[PDB]
Symmetry: D2
Subunit: 120 residues, 4 copies
Amino acid sequence: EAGITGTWYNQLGSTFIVTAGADGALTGTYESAVGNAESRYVLTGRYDSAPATDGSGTALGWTVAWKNNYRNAHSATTWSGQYVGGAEARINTQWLXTSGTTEANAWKSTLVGHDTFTKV
Amino acid sequence: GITGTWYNQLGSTFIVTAGADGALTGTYESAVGNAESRYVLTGRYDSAPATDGSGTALGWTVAWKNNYRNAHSATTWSGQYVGGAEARINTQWLXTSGTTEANAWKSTLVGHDTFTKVK
Amino acid sequence: AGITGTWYNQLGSTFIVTAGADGALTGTYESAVGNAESRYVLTGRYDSAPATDGSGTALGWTVAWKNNYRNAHSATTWSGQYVGGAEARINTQWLXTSGTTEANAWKSTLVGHDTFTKVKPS
Amino acid sequence: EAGITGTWYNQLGSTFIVTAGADGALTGTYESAVGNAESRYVLTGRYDSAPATDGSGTALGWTVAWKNNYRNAHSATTWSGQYVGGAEARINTQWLXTSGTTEANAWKSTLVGHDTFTKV
Ligand SMILES: O=C(O)CCCC[C@@H]1SC[C@@H]2NC(=O)N[C@@H]21
Ligand SMILES: O=C(O)CCCC[C@@H]1SC[C@@H]2NC(=O)N[C@@H]21
Ligand SMILES: O=C(O)CCCC[C@@H]1SC[C@@H]2NC(=O)N[C@@H]21
Ligand SMILES: O=C(O)CCCC[C@@H]1SC[C@@H]2NC(=O)N[C@@H]21
């Protein structure tokens, strides 16, 4: 997809390099400006390869597990959201970060936030 | 010990392979909502989890489009796998529907699914 | 019957609530976990005229995690529904926000789900 | 503390009128510019009345049940957040809306988002 494929950046300065395949796949890398993270991490996702043409955005999602060759955070984040094309295009997301925990700590495994991505 | 067939409390069926270098790939069949048959899923998991008996962090996405139906929709599950005795994948989820900018504020459902090895 | 009661969640926390007749929820919350001890004030609101087709009764409430013993600089809100019947239940999802710097604001917020029954644990 | 009490507005045009009591109570009204809402609704909540002084925000939250004299949506929204001071005062929140549903529809009961409130 000739909208989503690209390098994006969020309000935190993280970098989201992604390819939208014509089968609906998202593949690429993510580098977080914050948290227990360094360099690039593999990502994978899906998006709607045949969106409605009524002004609606294009639904998508992706996952990072925060292990690469330099560092393991024992944690993973999913972003669920939509691509808004056109003028200044955006990916608006909400995200769930889950840490590996004990059964006793499982109640505090999950952070929630919103990230917004632009090409600038 | 993730690879296999898992079921959530709604009767949905999550068929998944955990590749050696952290990939999750497979299919999801939802028992509810605007869905029929299988959907592709991909995701990631921590292939080197802490061995202090913490669960294994993971997540996956399904875009709700296959050859039968397109809900203009995508869900991510974020969670952890706990093995052993009565093994479980405990998740929370975010479904975003495609909406106009005017209805963006209501784009997103939230919930929780517990997946288990027994139906 | 109803919401007014002493409720307990899967964690063993204790939710003592009164449902006032024009929508108010008042009571105390004691958490078994986290940076907290003893009871905390809560307030909240509920649908005082639910549907009558089986639909649950929508509600929510807030606890700010400051009492006389401790201050966590935190607040949780539970959003959910009361289901009546065989064993009354309050299913919830909750959002805990800590006071953070502007720089740490991205990580201010935990999310979970708490299910409450009237059954005491031991 | 001082700064919460007042009239606030979020990015959707909604109006949040709130009084912070010195004991940690929040009371007031909430007019939503969207959804199945009309006119004012009662809110209550709580805030950390003795917040840290390292410019950290003040934790807070409130509830609105969407029933007033005009209308009943069979639903309730909680906002959880923090107040942040200075020349650009704001209340940054994430919110959960729960609709009353049948037991079969429990899984789809809850909507999530984020509101940013600004001091006029
Ligand atoms: O610290 C960890 O557990 C791993 C790094 C997490 C960074 C988070 S994920 C959501 C948010 N968006 C970002 O780009 N960074 C943070
Ligand atoms: O209706 C749609 O938009 C597509 C199907 C959504 C079904 C939801 S996603 C979360 C939840 N868990 C399931 O197993 N199914 C539902
Ligand atoms: O640690 C804090 O900041 C205050 C205590 C938080 C306890 C959380 S709120 C959600 C979950 N459910 C409970 O009953 N307790 C924990
Ligand atoms: O439609 C309903 O069920 C009642 C109105 C809900 C309004 C929502 S709640 C969060 C969001 N922020 C607002 O100010 N309004 C919407």
